[PDB]
């Protein structure tokens, strides 16, 4: 990330001193000792998942005493939760039911 000198407002560079790494200006004496953990997370865009789970994938989210799907009222359906974008998104829930003479897709 860009960080700028409070004095002259040029761009700081990271360098190493005798006790710490420092943010340092190239044009004025100002330095800032990195005393503690500092971070910057990008969170880039992940792949699409729409055509990846279709067609009898290796799902696993099913559990004992799981709810039946609302239309058929049978537990013959899978359900999953995934991030669709990066993991700062709150996970969305989706489910699909597959029964005899019955095909549907629901949210």
């Amino acid at each position: 990330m860009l960080l700028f000198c409070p004095g002259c407002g040029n761009g700081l560079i990271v360098e190493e001193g005798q006790r710490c790494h420092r943010f340092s200006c190239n044009t004025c004496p100002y330095v800032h000792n990195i005393t503690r953990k500092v971070t910057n997370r990008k969170y880039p865009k992940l792949k699409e998942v729409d055509d990846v789970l279709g067609g009898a994938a290796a799902w696993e989210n099913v559990d004992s005493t799981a709810e039946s799907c609302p239309k058929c009222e049978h537990p013959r359906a899978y359900f999953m939760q995934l991030q669709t974008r990066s993991a700062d998104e709150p996970m969305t829930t989706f489910y699909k039911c597959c029964n005899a003479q019955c095909g549907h897709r629901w949210r």
Partner: protein
């Protein structure tokens, strides 16, 4: 089955490191600085890919800044840290900003030249089988990946067919592609004409065009070369070499 098709789809399609990493961060420390990449292994398990942290370590150090393999560690089964160095060729050690946007453009699985791909199905009632449309420019790579029937794959570009399969397959590709383009617009040409065109293009062991550069290797007469394009240069060249011409 489609489960077999998506493995070989992901085996050839260009998959970026920035497309499988959930967060890519710099971490500044009082003793060190590096870049930390945590592989979202859930989306690795869903995409059915042969990639983990040791594969990403090997995908790094292929055309990136000359980073050393010692500079990259595999501390977990997700995290991959890249300690940068001084490039020392018009570069400052603050090159972490270069790798912060450049490291998500390395490829960990697939072919570098393939743009995208799509699973294609048929419609006929007798069967349901899955062919594969690869918008790419590397024929030898698609013929070599496990799971793709290399005895039965073709291309549009005649240069790749000449480079991979030979001159005779390039002749057959020219025939089939000219006839396919003529069929798709409601026209019809007997196959002897396109056969004569393809045998005229491939009778010197190389696919020559119908440009002024392919005609300058097929035809020998100075007047035939100079009555079409670049009229003056052939005249001074035939004056220089003392080239006699036939009137045949």
């Amino acid at each position: 089955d489609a489960d077999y098709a998506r493995l070989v789809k992901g085996r050839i399609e260009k998959t970026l490191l920035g497309e499988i990493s959930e967060y890519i961060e710099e971490v500044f420390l009082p003793d060190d600085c590096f870049i930390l990449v945590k592989l979202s292994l859930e989306r690795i398990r869903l995409l059915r890919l042969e990639v983990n942290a040791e594969t990403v370590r090997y995908s790094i150090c292929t055309s990136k800044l000359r980073v050393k393999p010692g500079d990259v560690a595999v501390h977990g089964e997700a995290v991959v840290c890249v300690t940068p160095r001084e490039n020392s060729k018009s570069s400052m050690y603050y090159v972490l900003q270069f790798l912060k946007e450049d490291l998500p453009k390395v490829v960990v699985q697939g072919i570098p030249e393939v743009s995208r791909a799509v699973i294609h199905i048929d419609e006929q009632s007798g069967k349901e089988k899955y062919k594969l449309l690869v918008e790419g420019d590397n024929l030898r790579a698609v013929m070599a990946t496990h799971g793709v029937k290399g005895t039965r794959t073709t291309s549009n570009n005649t240069y790749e067919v000449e480079k991979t399969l030979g001159i005779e397959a390039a002749r057959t590709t020219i025939i089939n592609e000219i006839q396919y383009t003529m069929v798709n617009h409601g026209m019809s040409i007997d196959r002897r004409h396109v056969m004569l065109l393809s045998d005229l293009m491939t009778y010197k062991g190389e696919v020559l065009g119908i440009t002024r550069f392919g005609l300058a290797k097929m035809k020998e007469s100075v007047l035939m070369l100079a009555s079409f394009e670049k009229t003056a240069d052939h005249l001074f060249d035939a004056a220089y070499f003392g080239q006699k011409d036939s009137v045949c």
